[PDB]
Design a protein around this ligand. Structure first.
Ligand code: K
Ligand code: K
Ligand code: K
Ligand code: K
Ligand code: K
Ligand code: MG
Ligand code: MG
Ligand code: MG
Ligand code: MG
Ligand code: MG
Ligand code: MG
Ligand code: MG
Ligand code: MG
Ligand code: MG
Ligand code: MG
Ligand code: MG
Ligand code: MG
Ligand code: NA
Ligand code: NA
Ligand code: NA
Ligand code: NA
Ligand code: NA
Ligand code: NA
Ligand code: NA
Ligand code: NA
Ligand code: NA
Lengths: 59, 140, 57, 178, 72
RNA sequence: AGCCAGUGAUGGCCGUGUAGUGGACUGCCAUGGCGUUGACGGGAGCGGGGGAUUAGGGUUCGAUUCCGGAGAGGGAGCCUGAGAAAUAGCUACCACUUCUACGGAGGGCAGCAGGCGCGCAAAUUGCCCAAUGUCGAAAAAAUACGAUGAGGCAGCGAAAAGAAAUAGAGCCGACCGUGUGGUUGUUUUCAAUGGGGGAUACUCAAACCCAUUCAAUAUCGAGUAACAAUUGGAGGACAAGUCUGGUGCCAGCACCCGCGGUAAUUCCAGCUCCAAAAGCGUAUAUUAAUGCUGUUGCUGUUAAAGGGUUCGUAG
RNA sequence: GAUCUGGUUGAUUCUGCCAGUAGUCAUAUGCUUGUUUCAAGGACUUAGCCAUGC
């Protein structure tokens, strides 16, 4: 039947977004990324860079 | 091998004309039978009136209820079945309202595990169903 | 000129004021302040033109 | 509605949207020349492709062909004068070996940094957009300006700029009025 | 020029014109033809299968627009 | 798969009508003309110059600004003109329609702007003859201003196209990795510039937008730059998490393969990250991918496909 | 730029189609939008019906 519709979206607890400083935009953003991965890290001759690595938590 | 003539262009033209009817893609664009059977008269979207809300089951490996509605079109009074996407989103439809209906992709072929459904609901009361979902707008 | 201290235009010189009045276009004289006064709005003129098409004399 | 103006397109998106090798090569170019968006790179791609395509057609033509001589001279004149090819290379076959950074070397944002008027490659773009650079005593404020070979020594600060011999700028003026 | 095809009329004959048409896609030819009716004076006497030269005229009938000179 | 001839079909002879030739038409005569090299009939469709996609060959679109043709609700006749079988000319009939004193009289936006309806779907009931031209009994000036919704100008407008902001240099701690050189926040100066607003004013036919300029004795202004960038995604194709909560084959995602039955790499959310960016998703049609229409250039023993065998005309 | 990838099996090599991918002065709808230049704009369906002014 149609008795249960939108059940999950109405059940999930509410959580609010965080407040953060605005990131640079435009040409300043591309500049930030270029130093984010090609500088500011000394991992050279290995190319073993991971853009998004998470802490170990696998329960 | 085949005909290699230098004066045999007539035979080669006739061959290609006859054999071009054998592919379903080319035949569908030159035959006019598809447009008549298509509830949209060759149009991207269409407007209709909601008749009732139905729940159709999913195909065998899956198991669910897909929450469709029955819609009668306005331009030609044909009846179709359309699927309302996203969580919840059935409470925004109601009965006797007026909706904008679009294709599902694949150009008339059924999509996914929903049996025989090839249309989706886009606008309800001319506001936008996804905008209602994201709360960017309120129902008139 | 863009981003500069230069400007270019056109210029006319007439032998006397009498020749200037005769030849200069009206809107150019009106810029100085000495052209013909004004004329009524064009809409009213063409309105009466059709009205007086129903009448004689 | 009864108009006869013209317009066209200057760039083109690439097929295969996500190749890790092309993604990194393009990112390297952007963060080192200080570009704003990938469309600036893709402009250079098409202008390069046009010279290569016409050179390929001409090279296929036999030598002493009237079309080959006239067009061949014209393209070398443009390539030498613009600074793409050094004056020793003249065979029309060095056109095809042109690469992307060769064209990006002649950009006004680059040349300002090379001459030493700026402390970085992003400082130079800010200066260009804010009406400080004059090429031949004419203020130019468009980074994509491609400097000719006969105009590098004439590049200098503009008179109207505060860094030149102009009036004090915004900070000085509002401090005085304070 | 053409080939006399039929001489069943009175002071009138039919001539056939054979040519070859070139289709661009297949880089090959194909035979075509056109039929044309003309007026033939009693000075001449052509049989079916001869060659004739014809020059333009003014409209002499519903279809006739050419006249026969120098049967060969 | 046959078409054309009473009542013109193909040709001939004197004629008539036209501006003129002609079967355009009257009388008489002959029996012709077209067709598998696709006639006759049916379907879609205004032609072209050209657009999109492009190794090459091709496929597809073209109502639309230039050229040609046709029409003015439906369909026929005709006067005046050198020229019309004209729609802001006339006459009648057919369908809808306005005023009236009930005797009658009118109306034709597929011209300009505007309304109803139809639909997925499309702008102001604006100003001007300054430019470009046409018409004219006209050059401009005066005791004396030709018309012109052709035409041009501005309002609305992410169809699409071209440029391009949302910050640049350093300071002092805290550091991060690597071997002392970029780097990641914390305090803090120091210049520069345009969104924004105003003219001695330029433009303008008059207004607007650009372009100049914040003294030339003499002219306002970023610092949690609150002047705050979004739209889609993170199992594979395909760039990007073996992160943390909720649900429990339900709710839902999923273009395809698939995910969900208590530890969900896929659902609903928070945090990070990725693409491209004043742009970005979805639907439908179409081009390339497609050597899956093959002339260049396919396949036919078994995957779809060699006729049961001979003779034979056009080709 | 003369380019391809996922789905038939316990594995393998094929034929073959579904799905992915890039455009479109190509239309429409959704979300979001500071500056400037150039611009198409009731063909698509109903050559449907039209108040008022020119
Ligand atoms: K008429
Ligand atoms: K109109
Ligand atoms: K902003
Ligand atoms: K998630
Ligand atoms: K094949
Ligand atoms: Mg038509
Ligand atoms: Mg049409
Ligand atoms: Mg025309
Ligand atoms: Mg009219
Ligand atoms: Mg629109
Ligand atoms: Mg898709
Ligand atoms: Mg799993
Ligand atoms: Mg194709
Ligand atoms: Mg056999
Ligand atoms: Mg048999
Ligand atoms: Mg099998
Ligand atoms: Mg219409
Ligand atoms: Na040149
Ligand atoms: Na139009
Ligand atoms: Na007409
Ligand atoms: Na009408
Ligand atoms: Na009428
Ligand atoms: Na005029
Ligand atoms: Na105009
Ligand atoms: Na190919
Ligand atoms: Na078989």
């Amino acid at each position: 039947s149609l008795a249960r519709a939108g059940k999950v979206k109405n059940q999930t607890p509410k959580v609010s977004k965080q407040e953060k400083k605005k990131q640079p935009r435009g040409r300043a953003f591309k500049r930030l990324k270029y130093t984010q991965r090609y500088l500011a890290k000394t991992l050279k001759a290995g190319e073993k860079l991971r853009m998004n690595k998470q802490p170990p938590g696998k329960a | 091998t085949k005909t290699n003539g230098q004066h045999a262009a007539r035979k080669l033209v006739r061959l290609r004309r006859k054999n071009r009817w054998a592919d379903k893609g080319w035949k569908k664009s030159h035959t006019f039978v598809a447009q008549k059977a298509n509830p949209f008269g060759g149009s991207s979207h269409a407007k209709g009136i909601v008749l009732e809300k139905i729940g159709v089951g999913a195909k065998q490996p899956n198991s669910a209820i897909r929450k469709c509605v029955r819609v009668q079109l306005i331009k030609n009074d044909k009846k179709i079945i359309a699927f309302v996407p996203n969580d919840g989103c059935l409470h925004f439809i109601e009965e006797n309202d007026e909706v904008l209906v679009s294709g599902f992709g694949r150009s008339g072929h059924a999509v996914g595990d929903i049996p025989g459904v090839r249309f989706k609901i886009v606008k309800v009361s001319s506001v936008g169903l996804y905008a209602l979902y994201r709360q960017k707008k309120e129902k008139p | 000129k863009f981003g500069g201290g230069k400007t270019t235009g056109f210029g006319l010189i007439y032998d006397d004021l009498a020749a200037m009045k005769r030849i200069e276009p009206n809107y150019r004289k009106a810029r100085l302040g000495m052209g013909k006064k004004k004329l009524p709005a064009r809409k009213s003129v063409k309105e009466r033109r059709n009205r007086n098409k129903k009448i004689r004399g | 509605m009864r108009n006869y103006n013209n317009f066209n397109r200057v760039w083109k998106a690439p097929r295969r949207p996500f190749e890790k090798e092309r993604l990194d090569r393009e990112m390297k170019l952007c963060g080192q020349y200080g570009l704003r968006c990938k469309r600036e790179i893709w402009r250079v791609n098409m202008t390069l492709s046009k010279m290569r395509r016409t050179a390929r057609l001409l090279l296929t033509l036999p030598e002493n062909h009237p079309r080959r001589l006239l067009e061949g001279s014209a393209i070398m004149r443009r390539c030498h004068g613009y600074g793409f090819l050094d004056e020793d290379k003249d065979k029309l076959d060095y056109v095809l070996s042109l690469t992307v950074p060769d064209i990006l070397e002649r950009r006004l944002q680059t040349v300002v940094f090379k001459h030493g008027l700026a402390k970085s490659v992003h400082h130079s773009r800010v200066l260009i957009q804010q009406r400080h650079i004059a090429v031949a005593k004419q203020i130019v404020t468009i980074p994509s300006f491609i400097v000719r070979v006969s105009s590098e020594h004439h590049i200098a600060f503009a008179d109207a700029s505060p860094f030149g011999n102009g009036r004090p700028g915004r900070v000085k003026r509002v401090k005085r009025n304070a | 020029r053409g080939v006399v095809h039929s001489t069943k009329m009175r002071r009138s004959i039919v001539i056939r014109r054979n040519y070859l048409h070139f289709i661009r896609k297949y880089q090959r030819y194909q035979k075509r033809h056109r039929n044309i009716t003309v007026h033939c004076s009693p000075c001449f006497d052509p049989k079916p299968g001869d060659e004739v030269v014809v020059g333009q005229c003014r409209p002499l009938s519903k279809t006739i627009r050419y006249n026969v000179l120098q049967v060969v």
